[PDB]
Symmetry: C3
Subunit: 156 residues, 3 copies
């Protein structure tokens, strides 16, 4: 007989994953209102409390300005529709600057250094209606028919 060995590769990333350990910033004094936010999508700020100091954020909508991207944690999320989400009325981890893996709806690889446009629901699309100050970072992969892209986030 002939003995055999096989080789397999792991995936590269998952939605909401922190790409690199390069000069990042996460805001933890945030609270969620009006529904749920998927891990890996932009969020908007509706109010910053004057004295309490907590920032009220929710899912990105039309005619607004994004503030940050939710990140992945094994303790703060809940499991719904076979995916990790931040439920209403709970603390959220929002990255304001760094490098992150974001969900994508496009079909063509982006160009390094170009501006990123979002859709009305917070997922990256090549031709969007929301203009941001974030940038592409060149990462482009796919995990079990889920499109992921790499985004560099600057502080607003």
């Amino acid at each position: 007989q002939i003995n055999a060995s096989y080789q397999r590769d792991m995936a590269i990333a998952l939605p909401g994953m922190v790409a690199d350990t390069s000069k990042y910033n996460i805001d933890g004094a945030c609270v969620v209102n009006e529904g749920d936010v998927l891990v890996g999508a932009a969020v908007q700020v509706v109010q910053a409390q004057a004295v309490d100091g907590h920032k009220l954020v929710k899912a990105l909508t039309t005619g607004t300005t994004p503030y940050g991207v939710a990140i992945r944690s094994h303790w703060q999320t809940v499991n719904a529709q076979n995916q990790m989400i931040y439920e209403d009325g709970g603390a959220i981890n929002v990255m304001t600057s760094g490098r992150v893996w974001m969900l994508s709806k496009s079909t063509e690889a982006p160009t390094f250094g170009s501006a990123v446009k979002l859709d009305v629901d917070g997922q990256e699309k090549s031709d969007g209606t929301i203009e941001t100050t974030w940038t592409y970072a060149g990462g482009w992969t796919k995990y079990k028919d889920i499109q992921l892209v790499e985004v560099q986030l600057h502080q607003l």
Copy 2:
């Protein structure tokens, strides 16, 4: 008789106090020249030495872009005018990036993410004649008839 219990709340912040421990930067190689600086007020850079490296700073005036905000210290400052000031001819801490409490002369709470306008004397004002690239953070409180506001400082 009926027993009684009393409760009091501490004040939130003091002028020149650092707000959050999130990605700040302090320049300590500066020196005050020809004047005094109140903690929690903007400063201007007059001349940057080519070889020595020390930077001459003073109080902000009309027709000049600010550099940073002086912060508190129990060892570097001196006590004068019922306040905590930086005397002339001494090393001074200037915070260049981060979140800082600043003295203000306004009466209406600012909107999160808007531009910051300074006055001639170096204090925040709703209607200022000096343009600035800093932003608001939402903090808005008062400590015994002193108005304070939370400012996000970006590196020059």
Copy 3:
């Protein structure tokens, strides 16, 4: 006879040397492509790999946008034409933010806070063609005949 004693002063900086310990950031997952890079000169990114993650960099030319500045490293560099360089097909340290000493071609001191103009070969020079978003940090010295200048670099 009577005795004597002397005094000498060391130079301030060297090309491609980190100016100080401010908030900086380096990139070490870059590879030099088709040529060599001088230590202390700007570089440009030609391509970023989609799945592998490396970044191909080269010397700056006309009609391109700068990305960073190479820095000194006694281990990863090679000696050529009596200088320190990064040879082709190897790793390279690229400083993407912070204060750095870099080579210059100008003849007079620069103005603090002014924008940086670069030449087609990647060295700082007044009235140059390429426009960047970096600033001058107030440093002007010569080392045994080479002209150096201190630059503040922000992330793209």
